[PDB]
């Protein structure tokens, strides 16, 4: 809808493909930028449309936010593993890698494991068991 | 009053100033069974004598930093005075003869609140009043 | 020009008011403002 | 007796203590309660004087840690010779040392960073190095990259040799305390055996490798015709067309040295005293003669002190005889004790020795920087303008960090190793007994010079803005000439042997080809005013650091300061406030003042060289300098330093995008980050930050992801140490990226 | 002339009295501890304000405070 | 040798060759600030005249009026009027404000002017001193071309 | 057409009325 | 930055030294009515924020004025 013409018929992007070097950085990644929306200066913008970029914007969400909550869930399930062993003061410096990998492959299916603790009420700690200040 | 021989000190620069002549001046007095050398609180090093020693200092923190040094020379008999310029020597440390670390009787609970520290009143309790919130005569 | 003039009315008045309030009067003023800062109560 | 004593196997060799970090301090070995244990493990790992108490077990840790350090220099020294071997254009540079730029350290083809591989001349794509390694290997006689490669191999087997000798002298044969305490015998083998046999070994390399090779390289033998350096000793007829006044035989050519007919050596041991007008460096006959007079003077002076054969001097008797029955009568004020009890200071404590060895190695590295620009020692060094400035700027910064370290350990000595027993009324007691007269007159001459060097830059800045250029301290207005420094430039050119040593003083313009190597550096009012900026900033750097050495024991504020420690934040908010009263926080404040002092030394250098020394010579004789006489007229206002130096000479680092100087434009802007980032730690305090972790710890205790290593804000000392480690990092890398983008855009 | 108040969470470990550089605090007898002691501050005119008694108190949210008030010539440590 | 200050090792000074010499003690204790047997007006009259005389110096040769000759000596005198009015203002302001119950301590050397009638007399000396000296060095500078001649015999 | 020479002197005596009344307020607020 | 990087007890040991050299010198007839101390902790945070602010405004209020009234 906007003035973000695709880079196929943008009259300022074809000069970036006209005089350019070759090696690996300005030939194959430049013809892959051709299906991207670009303004009046030939630079590929990132707009948010309804359906033409519905999943084109949702791959950087769903790919990142899975392995954002994969680092976070394997770090949460490791700190909870070493506190039931009653040795958490010394297991945080010397990382017990047979358990941290065991708590990593338990976090590979973390979206269907967080909601098993939300409906069971075990994700959050209740407010009368958390240290606070004089308030 | 006070008396004693000064230690062998070759003069310093961190010693007394015009405050010691005009406002107040302190004097520590100990006795030594040895001709040993100690570090001055005014910078340097001095040799204390074998009789009664006497050293004029400028403020009370210099005497007890020196008094904490003589207690490592196993000399625990020092008396600290406070000399007003009219000549009035009061005797301030140790006041009762006993050191303030170990307990003696007859001493008073002075500046003592009979509450926990966390239950001091709010500063809006004492608004436009003379007292502060840590004086607070309730509990 | 090579001189500070004034086309405005009473152009002699910055000639005396700029030396007055900036280097002639303030050392009297800093004297009076020092005699009540360091004034003793009895 | 000066005998050797060792200890047979004092320390076991096992990985049992590698599994227990913090074993050296007793409070660190008991566990990691908070995250302050993380930082205290690295702030105390080399404090060997607090791990143990005895000097016999400390000094074995010192001796074995020098070996592991020497094995780290040899890794880096084998990385400079290996990068000149495999990843350089040392072949193309040695053939043509004018058109081809010195380069090592090529960049990998990933992430588009091969734009840093600019054209170095001759089809080589790399980064123009400014370290002077290429000009130094030519002076050593390197010709092919095989000789560089088997120097890098020979240093890796010298790193494993020095690393084996640190394991051997801590775990197998560790010496005893009376082996470390004969410092008279140590000075005999370091003067004569290390500095005397090192400059006797090197003058044997110069006349046998460097003097034949650099003679044939000036005739342009183009690296086929030149012989390998063993062919000047195996074939002694080859070094007879060169230097014919000698004989050059295995036994027949040495005998002029023993029969004292030293006129046979006068063609390759000269006293010319000038720059080689084909290369720009000093004559290598003049350098090879110089090391021979240094090796004689050091091997002689290594027989001064008395070891076990009776004869010699003893420092114990020379120090204890400087009392005051025997002095000059105008310096007879230093005590009837004198400095008895001072040989016991520099033998029974390593911090007393480190404070002299750092201030001497710091002041040596600035003397070195001032001599390698005025008397350039290497062939084609002086015309590589990116190398002249990056070797002055390097050794000034290196040699100014070590000065602040010489004043840090002169304050760790007072807090820890100072003894009023052995120092009664000696030359060190009498300094602490008047330390309010040292600091009163130092804090006046810092104040006298701040008005008479900086406020004369604010007088010129106001007269230039007023339109009164006849009222300011110019060469055209009120002249302030360096009368006593223009006179020493007159002395050092009227005492010439026949060639004018150091063209910086006067006479001659060395203009070896294309650019100009050395020119007279004349001194006007702009050089009077800037040498008092240096005199002002050195004195405040002294005043900050000397106040931390004298007032490390006690003060009038805190008279028991030596019991609180060397590295403590404060003594509470009493007495009005006593923050930064320690001796550590005068090293911390003297690091900013070292920075401000040395960044004006390298800015005085970088602008006086461009305007009054460097440039290009045409076909008539006039020189067009890089900025063109700009220092004389515009370096007297600090709007001129802002406009004509910082704004006008950063047009090469600002407009350095899309080009081969692209990383210098990023390090310039990455430098400004770390400076402004430093001000978070310097300006704020940890009670805001500890009270901010508590609201963030809550959001982890809520989601049950709280740690047991309890998150604490950094210490007061640790928050000040990371605010000066970033100021002195992002303030240096923004000057490194500006000195090098400006000069590697020219050459 | 600061204000050193002392609260009843004391345990009588005498650590604030050994840490005071100016002899402001001293131990008086009491009934609410095993040592039978509590600190008192009779020489609060000698309070230099440095809060070194506060770093030595081992009770959680410490039983002694220094309230920095109207500072004078001996509560600021001026030898001149 | 450096002994303690007047025999007291507890005092914060040293009896050094600069402050306790025979020479530099007989020079400092004979300067008009410390000379024995002077009224405080004659102290200030001699202190002032030595100061008005030199303070017209640094403005008639490197001042803003140095290019001329008759106007140069005016801007050097006008400087030393303003330096010595505002300094003799500051010591009437000093004696009003420090003599109120603490006469430099009623209980001592290097400051022997502790009375407020010995300081109001001093302020009258430094005013008339530093402006007799400022005029004597003004009349010797506007008459310099006539004083070069009588010190060279050019007046026969 | 700027203001006259007298209108400057008229303004200087009118502004003595909030110059003296500023002194009555600054001392009734008891400095 | 002097009031923000350097803190109070660097300067109290330095004013303690310049007040020594004033009492022990001749011909200096002044004497402080009230004793010179290094100014307090929460004061130099304000004294060093006043200069930070004024130097933020004198620099940008002279760049915004002079880079617009010259190149319009
Ligand atoms: C408060 C507003 C204000 C401000 C900022 C100024 C500013 C200035 N005036 Mg002024 N002036 C004012 C009001 C003001 N005027 C009014 C109302 C009158 C009519 C009486 C005048 C009449 C006047 C004359 C005749 C002259 C100036 C001049 C000047 C300039 C230099 C100052 C000086 O030497 O003269 C001294 C100032 C006065 C004699 C009068 C100022 C007092 C006014 C009435 C009130 C200001 C006090 C203020 C409220 C204090 C609060 C601030 C405090 C809390 C810090 C300066 C730019 C000089 C000039 O033209 O420069 C080229 C000049 O000679 N003014
Ligand atoms: C001061 C020590 C030092 C430093 C800073 C470097 C730095 C570097 N080396 Mg080097 N190296 C060193 C010592 C050093 N080396 C020594 C002592 C040897 C001999 C064993 C080598 C042998 C070596 C090789 C063979 C290579 C490097 C390469 C590199 C580059 C990338 C290496 C990496 O990815 O990580 C990098 C600039 C690589 C390179 O330059 O890529 C073209 C590479 O090929 N180095
Ligand atoms: C692989 C061989 C090896 C092994 C197993 C050890 C093992 C040990 N060394 Mg060591 N050391 C070595 C080689 C080795 N070293 C080399 C090559 C050097 C020369 C740099 C040193 C110089 C050295 C010093 C100075 C010290 C140790 C110390 C130690 C002990 C604790 C070190 C630690 O980090 O924790 C530990 C048992 C420390 C120790 O003995 O603790 C009291 C000690 O201070 N080492
Ligand atoms: C002539 C004999 C000799 C030589 C050459 C050395 C050389 C050295 N000593 Mg040693 N020392 C000696 C005798 C000698 N010492 C004696 C008799 C004593 C007893 C008092 C000591 C006690 C001593 C101590 C306590 C220390 C040294 C240290 C050092 C090193 C200083 C590092 C440096 O900057 O230089 C240049 C660096 C080089 C690598 C040059 C190499 C010199 C080689 C080893 C000489 C022989 C090579 C070959 C055969 C020719 C250096 C290698 C310090 C050190 O770093 O410990 C390792 C140090 O801690 N020495
Ligand atoms: C006074 C001593 C002295 C001086 C002036 C020089 C000078 C020089 N050396 Mg060197 N050298 C020396 C001692 C010295 N050396 C010693 C003792 C050794 C053995 C450890 C060496 C081993 C050596 C090697 C391997 C090489 C050189 C090279 C060079 C040239 C390079 C530039 C440079 O070093 O910066 C200038 C240096 C200084 C200004 C001082 C250096 C520090 C010395 C040790 C100070 C000694 C203290 C001295 C007694 C006190 C005098 C005060 C003075 C420092 C101001 C240059 C002409 C290079 C070369 O051959 O060029 C062609 C080279 O590759 N030297
Ligand atoms: C450590 C220093 C060192 C070393 C290892 C050598 C080693 C050598 N020199 Mg020598 N030399 C030196 C320093 C040194 N020199 C110095 C300082 C001078 C005075 C400048 C000389 C001047 C000299 C001459 C004139 C000759 C040698 C020669 C030689 C070679 C044979 C001499 C012999 O057998 O005995 C030999 C490899 C001889 C040679 O073979 O010439 C190539 C030869 O004739 N040297
Ligand atoms: C021969 C040189 C030398 C040696 C042996 C030492 C040795 C020592 N210094 Mg030291 N110092 C030096 C030079 C030296 N210094 C210089 C040149 C300076 C000026 C900056 C200092 C200023 C200094 C201070 C202020 C302190 C020391 C301290 C110490 C002791 C402990 C070091 C430590 O905590 O572990 C190692 C810690 C680290 C490696 C962390 C430092 C992180 C660096 C700075 C980042 C570098 C940035 C990088 C380039 C990117 C130790 C005995 C500490 C002490 O308490 O003394 C008893 C102390 O507080 N030094
Ligand atoms: C540009 C900012 C700046 C300025 C102006 C100063 C100024 C000063 N510093 Mg400082 N410092 C700074 C930044 C600055 N610093 C920073 C960023 C740090 C961070 C680490 C420090 C840390 C530091 C330390 C640790 C020390 C100083 C000291 C000093 C004093 C040096 C004595 C002197 O030079 O006399 C000359 C005065 C000047 C150079 C200031 C400029 C004078 C102007 C141009 C003249 C003013 C004209 C006129 C009088 C104005 C009056 C007009 C009227 C209307 C009011 C001096 C006042 C040292 C000291 O105490 O000295 C004894 C001291 O030890 N500084
Ligand atoms: C260049 C200067 C600089 C920078 C980058 C920051 C950055 C930051 N400040 Mg600030 N600050 C500064 C100067 C600066 N400060 C100064 C001079 C003051 C006055 C004393 C403050 C006082 C201040 C306060 C009081 C607070 C902050 C906070 C923050 C954080 C903001 C939240 C965030 O995520 O942003 C961006 C994150 C970054 C920029 C981090 C950089 C990422 C690095 C480069 C990763 C790579 C590391 C690797 C080794 C390289 C952030 C780290 C707030 C905070 O902590 O929020 C909870 C906070 O309350 N600052
Ligand atoms: C920001 C700031 C802090 C807070 C500083 C902190 C919290 C240090 C930040 C370092 C972080 C926490 C590094 C930790 C890295 C972790 C180990 C995670 C890495 C794990 C991966 C590598 C897997 C202070 O404590 C402080 C104290 C005094 C004056 C100023 C300041 C100050 O400015
Ligand atoms: S304040 Fe501290 S030292 Fe005093 S009684 Fe309480 S716990 Fe013990
Ligand atoms: S403030 Fe200082 S002197 Fe006062 S009670 Fe606390 S530690 Fe003692
Ligand atoms: Ca002029």
| Least Cα separation, residue D444 to chain E (angstroms) | 20
CB atoms within 10 A of CB D389: 22
Q: Which of F21, F18, F50, F19 shows the shortest CA–CA distance to F33?
A: F50
Q: How do beta strands B25-29 and B79-83 pair?
A: antiparallel
Please state whether the peptide bond connecting residue B59 to the residue before it is cis, i.e. omega within 30 degrees of 0.
no
State the best of F9, F14, F63 to mutate against chain D, taking most chain D CBs within 10 Å: F14
| Chain centroid offset of residue D715 CA | 30
Q: Does D725 touch chain H (CB under 8 A)?
A: no
CB atoms within 10 A of CB A39: 17
For chains C and G, CB pairs below 8 A equal 12
Give phi and psi for B89, each to the nearest 5: -95, 105
- The neighbouring-strand residues paired with E28 are E38
Three-class DSSP category at D506: coil
CB atoms within 10 A of CB A14: 13
Residue range E1-80, CATH number = 3.30.70.20
- Nearest-10 crossing angle of helices D55-86, D350-374: 30
Three-class DSSP category at F11: strand
**How far apart (Å, rounded) are the C-alpha atoms in residues F27 and F23?**
6
Residue F28 to residues D567, D714, F24: CA-CA distances in angstroms? 45, 56, 6
- The neighbouring-strand residues paired with D624 are D616
CB atoms within 10 A of CB D106: 19
CB atoms within 10 A of CB E79: 24
**How far apart (Å, rounded) are the C-alpha atoms in residues E15 and E8?**
15
The answer to whether D192 and D298 have CB atoms below 8 angstroms apart is yes
Q: Does B87 touch chain F (CB under 8 A)?
A: no
DSSP string, D161-201: HHHHHHHHHHHTEEE-HHHHS-HHHHHHHHHTTTTTSHHHH
8 Å CB contact of B22 and F105: yes
Chain F residues closer than 8 Å to C31 by CB: 89-90, 93
Helix (H) or strand (E) holding E38: strand E37-40
Q: Which of D36, D588, D674, D681 to mutate to test the pocket of ligand 10 (most atoms within 8 A of CB)?
A: D681
8 Å CB contact of D433 and B13: yes
Helix residue ranges, H only, H1-72? 2-5, 8-18, 20-23, 41-66
Structure tokens at D33: 């309660």
Burial class of residue A64 (count of CB atoms within 10 Å of its CB; 0-12, 13-18, 19+): exposed
Which residue, by CA, sits nearest to atom 45 of ligand 4?
Answer: D194
For chains D and H, CB pairs below 8 A equal 77
Q: Which of D414, F11, D574 shows the shortest CA–CA distance to B61?
A: D574
8 Å CB contact of F17 and D478: no
CB atoms within 10 A of CB F75: 16
**How far apart (Å, rounded) are the C-alpha atoms in residues D25 and D39?**
13
Domain that holds residue A26: 1-135
The answer to whether D446 and D539 have CB atoms below 8 angstroms apart is yes
The answer to whether D137 and D229 have CB atoms below 8 angstroms apart is no
The answer to whether B32 and B74 have CB atoms below 8 angstroms apart is no
CB atoms within 10 A of CB A79: 19
Range list of β-strands (E), D358-465: none
Q: How do beta strands A5-6 and B55-57 pair?
A: unpaired
Burial class of residue E68 (count of CB atoms within 10 Å of its CB; 0-12, 13-18, 19+): middle
Q: Which of D102, D98, D66, D97 shows the shortest CA–CA distance to D83?
A: D102
The answer to whether D69 and D63 have CB atoms below 8 angstroms apart is no
Q: Which of D678, D659, D608, D651 shows the shortest CA–CA distance to D738?
A: D651
CB atoms within 10 A of CB E74: 19
CB atoms within 10 A of CB B65: 22
CB atoms within 10 A of CB D202: 18
CB atoms within 10 A of CB G8: 15
Which CATH number characterizes residue A63's domain?
1.10.8.110
CB atoms within 10 A of CB D537: 24
**How far apart (Å, rounded) are the C-alpha atoms in residues D92 and D134?**
11
State the best of E1, E4, E21, E68 to mutate against chain B, taking most chain B CBs within 10 Å: E21
State the best of E19, E21, E22 to mutate against chain D, taking most chain D CBs within 10 Å: E21
8 Å CB contact of A123 and D704: yes
Structure tokens at B90: 């009061």
**How far apart (Å, rounded) are the C-alpha atoms in residues D581 and H10?**
6
8 Å CB contact of C35 and F97: yes
Domain that holds residue D559: 1-747
Q: Does B138 touch chain D (CB under 8 A)?
A: no
**Residues contacting F26, CB < 8 A, separation 6+:** none
| Strand order from edge to edge, sheet including B25-29 | B55-57, B25-29, B79-83, B89-93
**Residue listed under structure tokens 């801007």:** F75
Q: Does G7 touch chain C (CB under 8 A)?
A: yes
- The neighbouring-strand residues paired with E29 are E37
The answer to whether B69 and B83 have CB atoms below 8 angstroms apart is no
The DSSP 8-state label assigned to residue E64 in this structure reads: E
Which residue, by CA, sits nearest to atom 16 of ligand 3?
Answer: D167
Q: Does H13 touch chain B (CB under 8 A)?
A: no
Q: Does B7 touch chain D (CB under 8 A)?
A: no
Q: Is D271 annotated as a binding residue?
A: yes
3-state secondary structure D584-627: HHHHCHHHHHHHHHHHHHHHHHHHHHHHHCCEEECCCCCEEECC
Q: Which of D351, D361, D344, D348 shows the shortest CA–CA distance to D549?
A: D351
For chains B and F, CB pairs below 8 A equal 49
Q: Which residues of D45-55 are buried (b: 16+ CB within 10 A; e: fewer)?
A: eeebbebeeeb
Q: Which of C27, C22, D456 shows the shortest CA–CA distance to F81?
A: C27
8 Å CB contact of B45 and D420: yes
The answer to whether D122 and D90 have CB atoms below 8 angstroms apart is no
**Residue listed under structure tokens 């949210």:** E61
DSSP string, chain B: ----BPPB----SSSB-HHHHHT-EEEEE-B-SS--EEE-TTSSEEE--SSBB-EEESSHHHHHHHHHHHTTTT----EEEEE-TTS-EEEEETTTSS-TTS--SS----SB-SS-GGGPPPTTTSTTSSS-TTT-S--
Which residue, by CA, sits nearest to atom 3 of ligand 9?
Answer: D677
Which residue, by CA, sits nearest to atom 11 of ligand 1?
Answer: G12
Q: Does B6 touch chain F (CB under 8 A)?
A: yes
Physical contact, D and H (3 or more Cβ pairs within 8 A): yes
The answer to whether D681 and D719 have CB atoms below 8 angstroms apart is yes
| Residues A26/A29/A31/A32 CA torsion (nearest 10 deg) | -170
Q: How many domains does chain A have?
A: 1
The answer to whether H11 and D578 have CB atoms below 8 angstroms apart is no
Q: F1-156 belongs to which homologous superfamily?
A: Photosystem I PsaL, reaction centre subunit XI (1.20.1240.10)
Range list of β-strands (E), chain A: 5-6, 37-38
Q: How do beta strands D173-175 and D103-104 pair?
A: unpaired
E20 half-sphere exposure, CB direction, 13 A CA radius: 28
Indicate whether residue D713 lines ligand 10 (CB < 6 A): yes
Q: Which of B36, B14, A17, F58 shows the shortest CA–CA distance to D556?
A: B14
**Residue listed under structure tokens 């020493």:** D488
User: Would you put residue D156 in left (φ > 0), alpha (ψ -120 to 50) or beta?
Assistant: alpha
Q: Which of E6, E15, E17, E73 shows the shortest CA–CA distance to E45?
A: E73
Which atom of ligand 5 is closest in space to residue D282's alpha carbon? Answer: 57
Q: Which of D59, D66, D121 shows the shortest CA–CA distance to D90?
A: D121
Residue E7 to residues E27, E41, E59: CA-CA distances in angstroms? 14, 12, 11
Q: Which of F16, F107, D53, A64 shows the shortest CA–CA distance to B87?
A: F107
Q: Does F94 touch chain C (CB under 8 A)?
A: no
Residues 82-121 of B with CB under 8 A from E: 92-94, 100-103, 105, 107-118
DSSP string, D265-320: GTTTS----SB-TTTSSB-HHHHHHHHHHHHHHHHHHTTSB--TTS-SB-HHHHHH
Cα D451–D456–D462 angle (5° rounding)? 125
**How far apart (Å, rounded) are the C-alpha atoms in residues D132 and D138?**
10
Chain D residues closer than 8 Å to B59 by CB: 556
| Rounded-to-5 percentages of helix, strand, coil across chain F | 50, 5, 45
The answer to whether D318 and D186 have CB atoms below 8 angstroms apart is no
- Cα dihedral across residues D492, D494, D495, D498: positive or negative: positive
Ligand approaching nearest to the C-alpha of E30: 11
8 Å CB contact of D556 and E76: no
Q: Which of D173, D177, D166, D178 shows the shortest CA–CA distance to D7?
A: D173
Q: Which residues of D643-681 are buried (b: 16+ CB within 10 A; e: fewer)?
A: ebbeeebbebbeebeeebbbbbbebbeebeebbeebeeb
Q: Does E70 touch chain H (CB under 8 A)?
A: no
Residue D405 Cα to ligand 7 middle (Å): 8
Three-class DSSP category at D455: helix
Structure tokens at D41: 């493990």
**How far apart (Å, rounded) are the C-alpha atoms in residues D107 and D46?**
36
The answer to whether D301 and D194 have CB atoms below 8 angstroms apart is no
Give phi and psi for E21, each to the nearest 5: -85, 0
Chain D residues closer than 8 Å to A132 by CB: 698
**How far apart (Å, rounded) are the C-alpha atoms in residues H29 and D333?**
30
Cα E28–E29–E32 angle (5° rounding)? 120
Q: Which of A103, A112, A111, A101 shows the shortest CA–CA distance to A77?
A: A103
Which atom of ligand 11 is closest in space to residue E10's alpha carbon? Answer: 6
Indicate whether residue D673 lines ligand 9 (CB < 6 A): yes
8 Å CB contact of B18 and H23: yes
**How far apart (Å, rounded) are the C-alpha atoms in residues D245 and D270?**
13
Which atom of ligand 6 is closest in space to residue D233's alpha carbon? Answer: 42
Three-class DSSP category at D515: strand
Q: Does H16 touch chain B (CB under 8 A)?
A: no
**How far apart (Å, rounded) are the C-alpha atoms in residues A82 and G21?**
77
**Residue listed under structure tokens 């008694």:** E53
Cα D397–D400–D401 angle (5° rounding)? 90
Residue H51 to residues A46, D731, H3, H44: CA-CA distances in angstroms? 43, 22, 9, 10
CB atoms within 10 A of CB B47: 16
**How far apart (Å, rounded) are the C-alpha atoms in residues F147 and F149?**
5
The DSSP 8-state label assigned to residue D562 in this structure reads: H
Give phi and psi for B12, each to the nearest 5: -140, -165
**Residues contacting D154, CB < 8 A, separation 6+:** D78
**How far apart (Å, rounded) are the C-alpha atoms in residues D199 and D734?**
38
**How far apart (Å, rounded) are the C-alpha atoms in residues D419 and D416?**
9
Chain B residues closer than 8 Å to F4 by CB: 9-12
| Determination technique used | cryo-EM
Three-class DSSP category at D212: helix
Give phi and psi for D336, each to the nearest 5: -70, -25
Structure tokens at B29: 């007095």
CB atoms within 10 A of CB F85: 15
Q: How many domains does chain D have?
A: 1
Domains assigned to chain B: 1-139 (3.30.1470.10)
**How far apart (Å, rounded) are the C-alpha atoms in residues B68 and E52?**
15
**How far apart (Å, rounded) are the C-alpha atoms in residues H61 and F132?**
49
**Residues contacting D351, CB < 8 A, separation 6+:** D49, D409, D410, D412, D413, D416, D417
**How far apart (Å, rounded) are the C-alpha atoms in residues D60 and D58?**
5
**How far apart (Å, rounded) are the C-alpha atoms in residues E77 and D575?**
5
Physical contact, C and E (3 or more Cβ pairs within 8 A): no
Instruction: Write down which chains contact chain G via at least 3 CB pairs under 8 A.
Output: C
Indicate whether residue D567 lines ligand 7 (CB < 6 A): yes
User: Would you put residue D426 in left (φ > 0), alpha (ψ -120 to 50) or beta?
Assistant: beta
Residue A93 to residues A101, A106, D28, D40: CA-CA distances in angstroms? 16, 22, 13, 14
The answer to whether A116 and A102 have CB atoms below 8 angstroms apart is no
């Amino acid at each position: 809808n906007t003035t973000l013409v695709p880079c196929y018929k943008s009259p300022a992007f074809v000069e970036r493909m006209k005089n350019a070097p070759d090696s690996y950085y300005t030939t194959k990644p430049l013809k892959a930028y051709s299906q991207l929306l670009c303004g009046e200066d030939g630079l590929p913008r990132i707009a948010l449309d309804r359906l033409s970029l519905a999943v084109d914007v949702a791959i950087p969400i769903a790919i990142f936010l899975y392995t954002a909550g994969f680092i976070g869930w394997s770090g949460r399930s490791y700190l909870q593993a070493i506190k039931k062993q009653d040795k958490a003061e010394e297991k945080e410096v010397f990382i017990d890698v047979p358990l941290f990998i065991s708590c990593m492959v338990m976090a590979l299916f973390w979206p269907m494991a967080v909601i098993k603790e939300l409906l069971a009420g075990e994700l959050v700690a209740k407010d009368e068991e958390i240290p606070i200040s004089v308030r | 009053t006070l008396s004693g021989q000064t230690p062998i000190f070759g003069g310093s620069t961190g010693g007394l100033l015009k405050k010691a002549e005009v406002e107040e001046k302190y004097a520590i007095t100990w006795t030594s069974p040895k001709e040993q050398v100690f570090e001055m609180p005014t910078g340097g090093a001095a040799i204390m004598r074998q009789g009664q020693n006497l050293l004029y200092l400028a403020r009370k923190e210099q005497c007890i930093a020196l008094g904490g040094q003589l207690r490592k020379f196993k000399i625990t008999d020092y008396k600290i005075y406070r000399i007003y310029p009219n000549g009035e020597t009061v005797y301030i440390h140790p006041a009762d003869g006993v050191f303030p670390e170990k307990v003696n009787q007859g001493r008073e609970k002075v500046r003592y609140n009979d509450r926990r520290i966390g239950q001091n009143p709010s500063p809006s309790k004492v608004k436009f009043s003379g007292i502060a919130t840590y004086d607070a005569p309730n509990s | 020009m090579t001189q500070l003039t004034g086309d405005y009315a009473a152009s002699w008045l910055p000639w005396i008011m700029i030396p007055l309030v900036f280097y002639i009067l303030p050392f009297p003023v800093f004297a009076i403002l020092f005699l009540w800062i360091q004034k003793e109560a009895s | 007796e000066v005998r050797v004593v060792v200890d047979n196997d004092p320390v076991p060799t096992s990985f049992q203590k590698w599994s227990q970090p913090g074993h050296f301090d007793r409070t660190l070995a008991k566990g990691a309660k908070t995250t302050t244990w993380i930082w205290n493990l690295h702030a105390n790992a080399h404090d060997f004087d607090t791990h143990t108490s005895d000097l016999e077990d400390i000094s074995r840790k010192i001796f074995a840690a020098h070996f592991g350090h020497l094995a780290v220099v040899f890794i880096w020294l084998s990385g400079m010779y290996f990068h000149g071997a495999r990843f350089s254009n040392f072949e193309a540079w040695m053939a043509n040392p004018t058109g081809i730029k010195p380069s090592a350290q090529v960049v990998w083809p990933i992430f588009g960073q091969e734009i840093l591989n600019g054209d170095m001349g001759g089809g080589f794509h790399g980064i123009q190095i400014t370290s002077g390694l290429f000009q130094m290997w030519r002076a050593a006689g390197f010709t092919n990259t095989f000789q560089l490669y088997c120097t890098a191999i020979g240093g890796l087997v010298m790193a494993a040799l020095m690393l084996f000798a640190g394991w051997f002298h801590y775990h197998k044969r560790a010496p005893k305390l009376e082996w470390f305490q004969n410092t008279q015998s140590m000075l005999n083998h370091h003067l004569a055996g290390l500095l005397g046999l090192g400059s006797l070994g090197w003058t044997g390399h110069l006349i046998h490798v460097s003097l034949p090779t650099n003679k044939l390289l000036d005739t342009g033998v183009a690296l086929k015709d030149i012989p390998l350096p063993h062919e000047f000793i195996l074939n002694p007829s080859l070094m007879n067309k060169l230097y014919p006044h000698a004989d050059w035989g295995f036994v027949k050519g040495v005998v002029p040295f023993f029969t004292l007919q030293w006129g046979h050596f006068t063609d390759f041991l000269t006293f010319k005293g000038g720059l080689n007008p084909v290369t720009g460096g000093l004559w290598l006959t003049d350098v090879a003669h110089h090391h021979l007079a240094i090796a004689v003077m050091f091997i002689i002076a290594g027989h001064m002190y008395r070891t076990n054969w009776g004869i010699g001097h003893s420092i114990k008797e020379m120090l204890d005889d400087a009392r005051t029955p025997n002095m000059l009568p105008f310096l007879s004020f230093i005590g009837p004790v004198g400095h008895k009890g001072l040989f016991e200071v520099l033998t029974t404590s390593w911090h007393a020795q480190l404070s002299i060895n750092l201030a001497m190695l710091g002041s040596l590295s600035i003397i070195i920087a001032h001599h390698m620009y005025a008397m350039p020692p290497y062939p084609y060094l002086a015309t590589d303008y990116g190398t002249v400035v990056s070797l002055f700027t390097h050794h000034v910064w290196i040699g100014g960090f070590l000065i602040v370290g010489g004043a840090a350990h002169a304050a760790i000595y007072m807090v820890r190793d100072y003894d009023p027993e052995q120092n009664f009324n000696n030359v060190l007691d009498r300094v602490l007994r008047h330390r309010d007269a040292i600091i009163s007159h130092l804090a006046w001459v810092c104040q006298f010079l701040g008005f008479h060097s900086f406020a004369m830059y604010c007088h010129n800045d106001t007269m230039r803005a007023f339109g009164r250029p006849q009222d300011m301290f110019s060469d055209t207005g009120i002249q302030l000439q360096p009368v006593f420094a223009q006179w020493l430039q007159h002395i050092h050119t009227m005492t010439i042997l026949h060639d004018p040593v150091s063209y910086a003083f006067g006479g001659g313009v060395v203009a070896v080809g294309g650019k100009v190597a050395m020119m007279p550096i004349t001194l006007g009012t702009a050089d009077f005013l800037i040498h008092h900026i240096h005199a002002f900033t050195i004195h405040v750097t002294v005043l900050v650091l000397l106040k931390g050495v004298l007032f490390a024991r006690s003060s009038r504020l805190i008279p028991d300061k030596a019991n609180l420690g060397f590295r403590f934040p404060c003594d509470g908010p009493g007495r009005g406030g006593t923050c930064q009263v320690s001796a550590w926080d005068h090293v911390f404040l003297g690091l900013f003042w070292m920075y401000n002092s040395l960044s004006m030394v390298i800015f005085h250098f970088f602008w006086k060289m461009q305007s009054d020394v460097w440039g290009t010579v045409g076909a008539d004789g006039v020189v067009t300098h890089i900025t063109g006489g700009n220092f004389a007229t515009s370096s007297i206002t600090n709007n001129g330093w802002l406009r004509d130096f910082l704004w006008a000479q950063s047009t090469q680092v600002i407009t350095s995008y899309n080009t081969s100087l692209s990383a210098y434009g990023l390090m310039f802007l990455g430098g400004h980050f770390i400076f402004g980032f430093s001000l978070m730690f310097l300006f704020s305090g940890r009670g805001y930050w500890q009270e901010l972790i508590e609201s963030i710890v809550w959001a982890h205790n809520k989601l049950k992801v709280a740690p047991a290593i309890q998150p604490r804000a950094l210490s007061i000392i640790h928050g000040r140490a990371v605010g000066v480690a970033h100021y002195l990092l992002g303030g240096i890398v923004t000057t490194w990226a500006f000195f090098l983008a400006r000069m590697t855009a020219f050459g | 002339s600061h204000t050193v108040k002392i609260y009843d969470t004391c345990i009588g470990c005498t650590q604030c009295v050994r840490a005071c550089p100016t002899d402001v605090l001293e131990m008086v007898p009491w009934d609410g501890c095993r040592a039978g002691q509590i600190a008192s501050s009779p020489r609060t005119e000698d309070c230099v304000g440095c809060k070194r008694c506060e770093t030595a108190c081992p009770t959680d949210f410490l039983s002694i405070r220094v309230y920095l008030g109207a500072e004078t010539t001996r509560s600021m440590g001026l030898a001149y | 040798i450096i002994k303690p200050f007047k025999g007291d090792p507890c005092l914060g000074n040293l009896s050094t060759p600069i402050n306790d010499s025979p020479l530099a003690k007989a020079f400092i204790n004979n300067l008009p600030a410390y000379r024995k047997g002077l009224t405080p007006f004659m102290r200030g009259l001699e202190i002032g005249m030595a100061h008005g005389y030199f303070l017209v110096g640094p403005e008639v040769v490197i001042g803003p009026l140095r290019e001329s000759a008759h106007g140069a000596n005016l801007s050097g005198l006008i400087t030393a009027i303003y330096i010595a009015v505002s300094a003799c203002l500051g010591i009437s302001i000093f004696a009003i404000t420090t003599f109120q119950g603490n006469p430099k301590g009623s209980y001592d050397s290097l400051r022997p002017l502790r009375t407020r009638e010995e300081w109001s007399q001093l302020n009258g000396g430094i005013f008339l001193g530093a402006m007799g000296g400022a005029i004597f060095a003004y009349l010797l500078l506007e008459n310099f071309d006539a004083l070069d001649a009588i010190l060279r015999g050019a007046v026969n | 057409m700027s203001i006259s020479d007298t209108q400057v002197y008229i303004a200087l005596v009118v502004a003595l009325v909030p110059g003296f009344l500023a002194w009555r307020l600054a001392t009734e607020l008891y400095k | 930055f002097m009031f923000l990087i350097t803190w109070r007890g660097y300067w109290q040991e330095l004013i303690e030294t310049l007040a020594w050299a004033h009492e022990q010198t001749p011909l200096s007839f002044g004497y402080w009515r009230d004793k010179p101390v290094a100014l307090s902790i929460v004061q130099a945070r304000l004294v060093g924020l006043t200069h930070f602010t004024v130097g933020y405004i004198a620099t940008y209020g002279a760049f915004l004025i002079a880079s617009t009234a010259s190149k319009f």
